[PDB]
């Protein structure tokens with residue numbers, strides 16, 4: 001959600017910023033609704049005042065015949081309810097527009113139309129030169145009998161996997177290493193969160209109203225008929241960021257740095273036939289998430305810090321990657337500025353996204369009413385929120401298996417993971 | 429699913445066994461449906477033969493006028509389709525009865541009506557005598573700021589939790605310790621499984637057709653409209669046992685011992701107001717599961733082995749418990765024989781279930797068509813399946829926090845968990 005006073009005072013300036021993302025703001029519709037709203041607001045508030053006044057006249061006369069007065073108040077009450085419903089219908093119309101508007105890109109963001117207009121910022125590591133024909137992680141998984149997509153189709157359907165034996169152990173070791181790194185070295189506090197969330201949570205981080213189709217939704221439970229319309233989380237960013245919903249945080253307690261390891265569930269609608277083979281694009285994947293709740297003036301510095309935390313995962317694992325500044329046309333709905341880390345994937349002869357690190361500015365904080373106050377200044381402001389993959393575990397397994405594969409298909413265990421695998425040097 | 433030949437040859441004997449569970453088998457209805465089935469089966473198979481024959485007469489005459497013959501075959505085809513639909517309606521009626529029948533209890537199971545008729549088999553450890561008033565895990569969680577039920581209601585709703593900081597780390601350490609124990613010492617192979625499963629999987633392990641109401645169901649995805657009617661798993665027993673669905677296993681490859689650490693999702697319908705406070709009864713809980721696929725003659729020995737594996741978790745953690753033989757009236761739908769382990773919970777002044785270990789006999793194997801064959805004997809048989817909690821992680825956290833609490837609320841970390849917590853001795 002953008003600042004409503006910024007949409008009211010300068011809508012042409014906002015429309016100009018949003019045009020860089022390729023989003024057309026309907027300024028004329030917003031203006032026409034806002035002008036009708038002011039007419040209905042005055043009518044409604046006059047009816048509210050007169051009804052409140054005629055109700056007090058009854059109580060007055062009750063002490064000192066209240067029948068003609070009771071009829072007057074019941075007609076006024078009907079008129080007010082009608083005026084309030086008509087006003088509320090217009091408010092819902094404004095909201096349907098307001099809540100579908102993506103975040104204003106920060107000036108640091110380079111202008112572009114799509115991913116081909118993204119800017120490379122840095123590169124670390126040198127892609128391995130192989131003495132044999134590179135096998136992809138799917139072929140390597142079949143060789144070890146460790147990645148079974150056919151069993152997952154039998155259990156569920158497409159875009160699911162069953163991992164077995166040592167490769168399952170390896171995927172667990174990766175998550176353990178990530179959580180320990182962020183909690184022991186990077187100052188994040190660990191969290192266990194619900195994997196099902198309500199509508200308020202989804203509106204809070206921006207999945208609702210515009211991206212219901214990106215989620216798996218659960219039918220309500222019959223003994224919780226009106227309070228269990230839930231959706232599976234698409235990322236731990238959703239429950240973690242909402243932990244500060246309706247809160248006033250003492251600025252001394254900022255930054256709040258949270259980490260979680262969760263499964264993530266996505267419908268993966270559209271882009272038909274893209275990443276059909278393997279673990280890159282699944283309906284269920286594990287991800288170690290980093291979330292930061294910070295003071296408005298520290299979010300740009302927190303983005304650099306949190307991106308470096310995700311980069312450290314790749315560096316310690318010895319995985320070559322490139323850091324990319326996403327352009328205006330390739331950013332997510334909530335982001336005002338994003339960096340993607342793209343890991344080297346030897347069988348694809350390219351870098352593939354393994355992390356997305358974003359500064360959300362005050363966009364989710366406005367929706368959640370998450371604020372901070374200095375006891376000194378004695379003034380509240382909305383916080384800034386940030387989220388970053390540290391990392392997507394399935395895609396890290398893809399990168400690890402492919403970069404560390406041996407001639408016979410054995411997987412060399414990265415040095416930093418060996419204490420997580422009882423000092424095991426190779427799988428196979 | 430029970431043996432259909434056993435329901436046909438001796439239904440009174442089966443009804444007698446099932447009566448001990450408090451289940452009334454409708455023998456008269458099954459007999460009446462079975463007798464009508466034989467009438468419809470003969471009519472249908474005669475129509476199938478005559479249609480196949482009149483179709484061959486056409487091809488014959490095509491080489492040598494085929495119009496009166498084509499009309500005859502189309503009328504026969506309509507008659508057969510009608511006879512097949514009528515037969516299929518009767519088959520669905522038999523199935524609705526057959527697939528709602530619980531497993532026949534094994535003779536080892538003591539006869540009883542409910543949990544108060546269960547038999548204690550053994551006891552290990554001595555409940556701690558405290559020098560202060562015992563705090564429950566909810567009060568201890570508030571003291572540490574580590575178990576937050578209010579944040580989870582905000583994120584989702586009731587029967588959910590948010591764990592924060594060191595108590596979240598502890599819950600993770602418990603799962604790590606369990607998976608390592610079973611994989612390193614007990615011969616289980618680790619697995620990463622889908623947390624969403626299809627209808628075939630749910631029918632396979634017995635959740636369907638009778639217990640749809642015990643599950644969270646997801647609405648179908650619009651781009652997978654006819655293949656995404658899924659449910660969240662209530663236990664890793666569901667995806668793990670189904671890994672042998674439609675398989676013929678070489679008996680040399682038995683036992684297949686599988687472990688997984690997953691979240692588990694349950695609607696928790698009924699028993700209103702039971703275990704309202706705390707982690708004992710949640711909509712989402714973590715559990716380290718053990719599953720065994722064995723030869724029919726080894727399942728009773730495998731039950732003792734798998735129960736001992738769950739007991740070893742409690743012993744190494746220094747948690748007093750009691751082993752209970754469930755009576756006929758307290759067993760789950762699929763089980764033919766179950767042992768429950770009940771851990772000491774100091775604030776409740778009682779033992780609470782932390783594990784359920786079952787021999788399912790060939791009940792799920794029949795539904796899944798999971799079989800084994802000796803290359804020697806050259807004869808197939810249905811396998812036996814077994815499942816056991818090793819353990820429910822949330823309830824282990826309850827037991828750990830309460831049994832290891834200090835006077836000031838600090839949590840002493842069990843010795844065996846200290847290598848999982850970087851040698852940390854206490855939380856707080």
Ligand SMILES: Nc1ncnc2c1ncn2[C@@H]1O[C@H](COS(=O)(=O)NC(=O)[C@@H](N)CO)[C@@H](O)[C@H]1O
Nearest residue numbers: 235237280281282285353354355356388389392
């Ligand atoms: N369907 C998918 N299957 C597997 N991995 C995926 C899938 N979708 C995304 N990822 C991985 O998850 C990472 C983070 O996803 S994101 O949508 O870009 N961003 C977020 O979810 C933020 N909360 C930061 O993690 C991606 O960089 C990618 O590595």
Ligand SMILES: Nc1ncnc2c1ncn2[C@@H]1O[C@H](COS(=O)(=O)NC(=O)[C@@H](N)CO)[C@@H](O)[C@H]1O
Nearest residue numbers: 663665708709710713781782783784816817820
């Ligand atoms: N709703 C719940 N919340 C928390 N823990 C639960 C809940 N339901 C069951 N458990 C725990 O999970 C254990 C196993 O559950 S069970 O239904 O008895 N049996 C199974 O699921 C079998 N697959 C063996 O694990 C129970 O012994 C109990 O310790």
Ligand SMILES: [Ca+2]
Nearest residue numbers: 251252253254
């Ligand atoms: Ca501070």
Ligand SMILES: [Ca+2]
Nearest residue numbers: 332334335358
């Ligand atoms: Ca974001």
Ligand SMILES: [Ca+2]
Nearest residue numbers: 332340353356
């Ligand atoms: Ca992205």
Ligand SMILES: [Ca+2]
Nearest residue numbers: 679680681682
């Ligand atoms: Ca063998």
Ligand SMILES: [Ca+2]
Nearest residue numbers: 760762763786
């Ligand atoms: Ca069972």
Ligand SMILES: [Ca+2]
Nearest residue numbers: 760768781784
């Ligand atoms: Ca039970």
